[PDB]
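Can't attach files on this board, so I'm pasting raw text. These are the components:
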Amino acid sequence: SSFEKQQIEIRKQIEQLENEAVAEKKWSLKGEVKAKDRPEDALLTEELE
Amino acid sequence: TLANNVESKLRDDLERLKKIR
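---
Top answer:
Structure tokens for the assembled complex are below.
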């Protein structure tokens, strides 16, 4: 059924979001970051204020 | 090898900065 297809799509997205929630945050979301922790020249790409 | 990687990082920096402007 179409509803069932929606359910597979949703369950895939829930698996992705659960994995993302478990995963350690990106360096930008760690609060304090030193040059060693983050990739070298990571701030070059990113836009920071 | 390391020099080429540094060059590639410089190219990425340059193209991103170009996209900004």
